[PDB]
């Protein structure tokens, strides 16, 4: 049920860093060691810049909804739009350029171990320190369901 209109586009480069370039077109700041992940909750879409990804472990995009879980198609403009993350591990860019994560696929966000993470289309924007990582095919079973995804590792 995903649509491109369900992408929160609420970016505010108030620190004047130019971080938004890789959303269209070096180091991972405020590094979060994968171990002991924080729990996923409800994220206000007004704080989100660009696509939200979760990792089941396979990568899946999460779109804006209202606070009762109904898909919304306003590019995150409505200040009641949210991402209901609890409904495994997820990551997104917040409006001022900070990469945020919750949960795990211990792991954190897309990271499996401190040296490997799930590949997805916005990996290098969310984690620029992984530009030179190598990619490996992975297969994993979670409760009988088969996952096939690429992993990027150092």
């Amino acid at each position, epitope marked *: 049920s995903w649509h491109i209109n369900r992408t929160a*586009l609420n*970016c505010n*480069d108030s620190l004047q860093t130019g971080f938004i370039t890789s959303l269209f077109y070096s180091g991972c700041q405020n590094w979060d060691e994968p171990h002991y992940p924080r729990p996923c909750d409800v994220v206000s879409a007004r704080t989100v810049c660009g696509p939200v990804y979760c990792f089941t472990p396979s990568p899946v995009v999460v779109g804006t909804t209202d606070k009762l879980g109904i898909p919304t198609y306003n590019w*995150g403009e409505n200040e009641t739009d949210v991402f209901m993350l609890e409904s495994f591990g997820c990551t997104w860019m917040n409006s001022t350029g900070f990469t945020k994560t919750c949960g795990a696929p211990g792991g954190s966000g897309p990271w499996i171990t401190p040296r490997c993470l799930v590949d997805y289309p916005y990996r290098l924007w969310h984690y620029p320190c992984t530009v030179n990582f190598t990619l490996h095919k992975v297969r994993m079973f979670v409760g009988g369901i088969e996952h096939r995804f690429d992993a990027a590792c150092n």
Partner: antibody
Amino acid sequence: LLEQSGPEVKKPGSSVKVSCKDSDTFNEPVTWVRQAPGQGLEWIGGIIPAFGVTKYAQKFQGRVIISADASTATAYLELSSLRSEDTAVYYCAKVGLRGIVMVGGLAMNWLDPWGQGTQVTVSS
Amino acid sequence: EIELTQSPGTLSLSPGERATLSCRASQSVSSSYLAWYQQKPGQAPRLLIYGASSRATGIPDRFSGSGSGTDFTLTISRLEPEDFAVYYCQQYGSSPQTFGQGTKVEIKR
């Protein structure tokens, strides 16, 4: 550099499509403004080509369409239902990325670079 | 809609003189979101100042901007011949982004 299409001449009630080609920042936000003869500048609308989200000023809503073509790195402005009041120079310009503000896909910042402008004349 | 009022309409000054242009906003604008542009006949506008007081890339030292709230000023400390043109202010903090009506800086003789 942004290269805009050449001048256009149109009868009332027709449509016109002007283009804005850049030569490596295509998916960066593009904003259209117009300048009526002897007037200042007026926001028409814009697009973020990476996602396709468009925004329009109320005075052009339902009467214009902005689009972008990723293969040719070109953005487009289509105005429909033309009247003589639409005679103007139409400018394309890039929204600056550093310090940009986006709300619901509406991108605003200083504007640079600029296209050279496209003259559209609407007349019987 | 935020209206931008520029004064004077026309400024007549000799080359080498200091020029002061004003732009009055109908409502308060954050200084982060005000820019100045230069336009010469038949040409596209050219960004000069952004964020009220930051000079765009390639813009000479003699252009400076200042102001806050509802009153912003563009200053050209010493007019060169290539500086005589039309100048527009722009607010891009609140949609719709709006432009002032322009000040023409004219050669006094």
